[PDB]
DNA sequence: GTTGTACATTCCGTTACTCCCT
DNA sequence: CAGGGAGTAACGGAATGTACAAC
C-alpha cells in the first residue's frame, strides 16, 4: 500500500526494507533514511542543507562532507557507479538527485 | 475462541501468553513476552526506548540503559531472526526498535 | 531460567587525501 | 598554474549486539 517502487527497486517504509530486482539489499538506518528522502523527492535536486535538516537535523555550515560520504556509502550498496550514476546523480553546486528514469 | 494477533507463521496468544512460530511454542519469560507484545501491537511503528522501558520495567529511559537491547536480542534469538539481517525486528539508530509485519 | 554487565561489534561523522572542473 | 567542489578510505567515538557471569 505505502510501498513506493521504481523500475526494479522497491522501498518499503512499513518494514524498512528495500529490494533491487528480486534481491534484497541490506541497508543501514542512514542508508535507508537517506534513500527514502531522495526517492520522496524523485527527480528533485535535494540540496545539502535540506538533507541535513530532514535527516539529523543540523545546520549546513558551508563546510560539511557527511552528506557526500553518506551518498557514496549509499551509491556502493545500491550498485551504482559514481563515475556515471544511473540512480543517484550529483549536480555541481546544487546537491544530489534521485533518478526515476 | 482465543483472540490473538498474527503475522504469517508467527502467532501471539495473549490469553495464556504463549507465542508460536509455525509451528511450535516459543518460550519467553514474562518480561519478554510483555516487550514482544508491546512491539507487535504497534507493528510497522517505531517504538523508542522510553516507550519500551515504560512497559518492560515501567521506568523512564535514563541511560545508557541497555535492558531493552539484550531483551531485543533474546526475541531475535527466540524468533529465529538474524541481527545483521533482521526480518521481523528492525533496529533504527537513535530511535528505537520496530516490529516488521512482513 | 531470568537478567544485564562487560566486553564484542558495527555505524557514520570527521578527516584527509585524491582527481576533477572552472 | 591557482581554487574549490566532489569521491571515498580510513580513523575512532559512540550506538548497538550478546556470551556468560551473577542471581
Numbering used by the authors:
A (entry chain B): 135 to 235
B (entry chain A): 134 to 235
Task: Show sentences the authors wrote.
The RstB/RstA system is a ubiquitous TCS composed of the membrane-associated histidine kinase RstB and its cognate response regulator RstA. K. pneumoniae RstA (kpRstA) contains an N-terminal receiver domain (RD, residues 1–119) and a C-terminal DNA-binding domain (DBD, residues 131–236), with an overall sequence identity of 79% compared to RstA from E. coli and S. enterica serovar Typhimurium. As a member of the OmpR/PhoB subfamily, phosphorylation of the conserved Asp in the RD is believed to result in dimerization of the domain through a conserved α4–β5–α5 region, accompanied by the binding of the DBD to cognate sequences in the promoter region of RstA-regulated genes. Genomic systematic evolution of ligands by exponential enrichment (SELEX) experiments in E. coli have shown that RstA binds to the consensus sequence TACATNTNGTTACA with tandem TACA recognition sites.
The crystal structure of kpRstA DBD/DNA-23 consists of two protein molecules and one 23-bp DNA per asymmetric unit. The two DBDs bind on the same side of the DNA in a head-to-tail fashion and the electrostatic potential surface of the protein dimer forms a long and continuous positively charged region for DNA binding. The α3 recognition helix is docked into the major groove of the DNA and forms numerous interactions with the RstA box. The C-terminal β-hairpin also makes contact with the DNA, mostly close to the phosphate backbone. Unlike the bent DNA conformation observed for the PhoB DBD/DNA complex, the DNA-23 in kpRstA DBD/DNA-23 complex only displayed slight bending (∼10°). The two DNA-bound DBDs interact with each other with a buried surface area of 362 Å2 per monomer at the protein–protein interface. The interface mostly consists of β4 and β5 of the upstream DBD (bound to the 5′ half-site of the coding strand) on one end and the two loops between β2–β3 and β3–α1 of the downstream DBD (bound to the 3′ half-site of the coding strand) on the other end. The two kpRstA DBDs within an asymmetric unit bind to the DNA with similar contacts, with contact surfaces of 882 Å2 between DNA and protein and 899 Å2 for the upstream and downstream protomers, respectively. Specific interactions between the α3 recognition helix residues and DNA, which include Val203-T6, Arg207-G5, Arg199-G17′ and Arg199-T16′, provide the basis for sequence specificity. Noticeably, the α3–β4 loop swings ∼90° towards the template strand of the DNA in the complex, which results in Ala216 interacting with the ribose part of G17′.
